[PDB]
Design a protein around this nucleic acid. Structure first.
Ligand SMILES: O=c1ccn([C@@H]2O[C@H](COP(=O)(O)NP(=O)(O)OP(=O)(O)O)[C@@H](O)[C@H]2O)c(=O)[nH]1
Ligand SMILES: C[As](C)(=O)[O-]
Ligand SMILES: [Mn+2]
Ligand SMILES: [Mn+2]
Length: 333
DNA sequence: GCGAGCG
DNA sequence: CGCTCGCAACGCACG
DNA sequence: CGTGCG
């Protein structure tokens, strides 16, 4: 019952416990072996190209999703020769040797370690100080769901990006909301990219004020879709495209076209369904890397909000007080 | 899930 | 030699 | 101290 060895594109990867249940609800389809089988099916394809050279955090469940959840940002000092690491710097100044996705064996090793979900930073190593991706995180609040997420993405955010001359790429998160990624030239730092995300989010909110909120404070959000602008800060990740999530049916964060997203149901994309869905279908994100976009149009939105008196917004807990950050508390008591 | 180190 | 146990994220601002 | 928030 000893370990076995997988051959992943020339690299030998150790593999154990194929029949350990990770997702109790799926029967024969919820074992660690089924997870590794999924990742072998996607790890050599667009998942890899989307993750290439990014530092990632691991969300591991060595005892399955009902056991303890272990987030992990550091790779152990002692690790297999084929693994590559990269130094990322947190807002405090502390650092971490994070996994760098360079090869499908990186993804397979992560899955052998119990990783259900990979969580990339928005940078490419070794240029870890300049995001190449601006990321929009759409979060339905209680009383809203995926339908609101997809409606706002398709009917407010998409036409707005069109107006601004920008191209965005959507995916299901695998939870109840939506992610939209914009590829940018790595010319700006985390502060500038987060401000550009704030101005984009504020414009979406102005155009759909009954449906959309940017309030960090839960009290002021209402039954609206929250655009989580702090996900563009340093030391903030997104679940990767094609990652499985810790939901009971093992949903997958699924890249879609705008046309597909209009009618999507995230429960259709599972570690059990996704490989068959990918076959006979063109990659909707095939072109994400063909244009490295400028942040200019969004930075002009920033300047125009400044003209109307709107500046920076609060950061999350555990961040140092940032330059220009307003009081990190809910307002007007 | 792994590995240092203890009985 | 066989086993247990520690360990595997980020850690401040505000009243 | 409790509470903020992914
Ligand atoms: O505790 C956490 C929560 C979230 N995150 C990271 O922040 C991202 C967004 O946090 P999120 O709660 O919005 N989750 P998401 O994957 O967007 O699903 P959903 O909002 O239900 O549709 C996640 O995808 C993780 O990468 C963490 O790193 N730690
Ligand atoms: C985004 As989660 C892993 O706290 O459901
Ligand atoms: Mn989200
Ligand atoms: Mn969020």
């Amino acid at each position: 019952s000893a370990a076995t060895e997988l051959d992943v594109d020339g690299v030998k990867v150790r593999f154990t416990n194929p029949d350990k249940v990770y997702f109790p609800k799926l029967g024969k389809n919820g074992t660690k072996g089924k997870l590794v089988e999924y990742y072998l099916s996607v790890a050599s394809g667009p998942m890899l190209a989307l993750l290439r050279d990014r530092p990632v955090h691991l969300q591991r469940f060595p005892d399955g999703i009902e056991g303890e959840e272990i987030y992990q940002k550091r790779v152990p000092q002692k690790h297999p020769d084929y693994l590559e690491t990269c130094v990322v710097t947190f807002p405090s100044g502390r650092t971490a040797d994070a996994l760098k996705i360079t090869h499908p064996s990186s993804i397979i090793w992560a899955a052998q370690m119990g990783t259900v979900t990979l969580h990339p930073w928005q940078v490419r190593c070794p240029d870890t100080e300049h995001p190449d991706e601006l990321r929009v995180d759409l979060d339905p609040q209680p009383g809203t769901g995926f339908k609101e997420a997809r409606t706002v993405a398709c009917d407010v955010l998409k036409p707005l990006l069109d107006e601004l001359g920008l191209v965005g790429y959507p995916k299901t998160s695998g939870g109840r909301g939506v992610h939209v990624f914009l590829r940018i030239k790595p010319q700006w730092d985390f502060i500038e990219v987060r401000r550009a995300g704030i101005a984009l989010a504020r414009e979406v909110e102005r155009r759909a004020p009954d449906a959309v909120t940017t309030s960090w404070w839960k009290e002021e959000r209402g039954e609206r879709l929250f655009i989580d602008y702090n996900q563009n800060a340093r030391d903030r990740t997104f679940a990767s495209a094609y990652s499985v999530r810790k939901t009971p049916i093992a949903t997958v964060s699924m890249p879609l076209s705008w046309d597909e997203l209009r009618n999507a149901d995230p429960d259709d994309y599972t570690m059990n369904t996704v490989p068959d869905l990918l076959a006979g279908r063109d990659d909707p994100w095939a072109d994400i890397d063909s244009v490295q976009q400028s942040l200019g149009p969004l930075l002009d939105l920033v300047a125009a909000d400044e003209e109307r008196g709107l500046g920076d917004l609060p950061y999350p807990p555990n961040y140092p007080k940032m330059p220009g950050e307003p009081p990190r508390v809910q307002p007007s008591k």
